[PDB]
Ligand binder design. Structure first.
Ligand code: T9S
Ligand code: T9S
Lengths: 301, 300
């Protein structure tokens, strides 16, 4: 037993991380088959970042403008192109450590592991949720751009995130591996803020199931409720709506414990109104919303 | 910016994890050079659970009784010995993925990454601290025995923990990689219980220094405290005593933020008295004790 925020083992991804330098900018690239993926903003001087014309800055560049280092080995760049906000540097050598992989775009509420990197060197791994406002609450310092997020399904790595920027509130924004931003953000030095975040209702309920499974039971009660009734409480507390699709996804946990979702929604309703009456749940004084149902089932079964 | 419980990249440890089977018992082993390390309790049966005589049970085993398996490959055991509570299976192949490594015994308050593994396959990675009662608050299911805890400072892997057992309170106990238990625990299923646990005071102060570095100041106050007055208050909330050593270790974080250690001690005395009044520090509504002074500097 026990319940902890747990990342996927990162080794399949550690083997894909390289250093990418263009002029004075060094950051992280992802080396899969014979291509290195990194943020297109590596080609930008500080001056360029204010109003960059990427079309024009890039036709001005050539293969030899990009230094790509896998540990202590220079890769030769033999091609360059841009897809949305991601730069593709074709190299002379296919990565012998390329795992089985897909590029995937995740949905708000879904979780993934981040491998934080600096000068193409893996440095830490931690679990994030894609927030409803399309930010993630990461831990990133200068040089962390190009760090990637992923899931693992059997032997397949699904890459879902590349880190581009930090917003003024301390939260992080990036793209999928096809260079499409998550959220209404642009890769320019301009004024950008995260929308007001919302609480991921289905993940809080998953976490209450994990708490029960680990013998934290105090917050439970004899009552039940309806979507309509709960959702009017949810809207009031800045909670995402609970859909019928969410109730079905919590199916397994509802069975495995004897508490039905609207039975658990009754408990959560009470915690929102009345608070935790000075207790913790799984060593937290907050309602944790960065564990999905799958995360709980994975870790608890 | 941001502040997260951050584990080390697990790849260097993934390449060492194998499955060990003895009788009906399967658990994880650690394959370094020509040796597989695993808990010696893999050689116990149902009636060996209470008062196993390990020296008696091991002399009755031959190399071929131990089925070691790295992915598909069966590894052939050519030698076995016990060191304390750890079994060492010598094998005919050296692990080609063996990283630079060392074995280190850590003190209470120290943190490490855990690679949780089932049937020799790594499942997930997370951070833990050695609690002052010599347990860890982990996430471990049946089969996780032989999972290890480690740090990776400067490309050298320091192994500090191997998982042996879960105690009745749902907390976890194991050994260093020389097989000596952390705490007064033994590898028998005779009734055991952890000492009352305490909060790791030096780590809470480091985490308050992290919050200030990330631009939180709301909990500072105009007060100071003597070290002795701090300890007399903090022990009334089940906090560990803060020693001069702990004060010395925070000197760098003090210097970087310009808040004296005993000034920060007055902030913590106040937070214990007041709670947080609907506020949070670095995303938490509790005081966090599983980041060391070194972890704060590494991450910030
Ligand atoms: C006060 C210093 O902050 C920075 O310059 N950055 C760069 C940067 C880029 C991406 N994520 C986070 C960061 C932190
Ligand atoms: C079926 C055994 O009961 C459990 O749920 N355990 C075993 C066990 C053994 C070692 N560490 C953790 C655990 C969790």
């Amino acid at each position: 037993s026990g319940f902890r925020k747990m990342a996927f083992p990162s080794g399949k991804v550690e083997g894909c991380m390289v250093q990418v330098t263009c002029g004075t900018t060094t950051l992280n690239g992802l080396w899969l088959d014979d291509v290195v993926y990194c943020p297109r903003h590596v080609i930008c001087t500080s001056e360029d970042m204010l109003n960059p014309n990427y079309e024009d800055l890039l036709i001005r560049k050539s293969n030899h403008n990009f230094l790509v280092q896998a540990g202590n080995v220079q890769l030769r760049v033999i091609g360059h192109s841009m897809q949305n906000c991601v730069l593709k540097l074709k190299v002379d050598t296919a990565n012998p450590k390329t795992p089985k992989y897909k590029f995937v775009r995740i949905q708000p509420g879904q979780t993934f592991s981040v491998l934080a990197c600096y000068n193409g060197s893996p440095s830490g791994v931690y679990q994030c949720a894609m927030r409803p406002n399309f930010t993630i609450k990461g831990s990133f310092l200068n040089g962390s751009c190009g760090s990637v997020g992923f899931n693992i399904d059997y032997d397949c790595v699904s890459f879902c995130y590349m880190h581009h920027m930090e917003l003024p509130t301390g939260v992080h924004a990036g793209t999928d591996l096809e260079g499409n931003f998550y959220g209404p953000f642009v890769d320019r030095q301009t004024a950008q803020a995260a929308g007001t975040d919302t609480t991921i209702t289905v993940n809080v309920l998953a976490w209450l199931y994990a708490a029960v499974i680990n013998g934290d039971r105090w917050f439970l009660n004899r009552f039940t409720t309806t979507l309509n009734d709960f959702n009017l409480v949810a809207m009031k507390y800045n909670y995402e709506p609970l859909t019928q699709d969410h109730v079905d996804i919590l199916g397994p946990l509802s069975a495995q414990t004897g508490i039905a979702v609207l039975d658990m929604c009754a408990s959560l309703k009470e915690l929102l109104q009345n608070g935790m009456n000075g207790r913790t749940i799984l060593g937290s004084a907050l309602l944790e919303d960065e564990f999905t149902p799958f995360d709980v089932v994975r870790q608890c079964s």
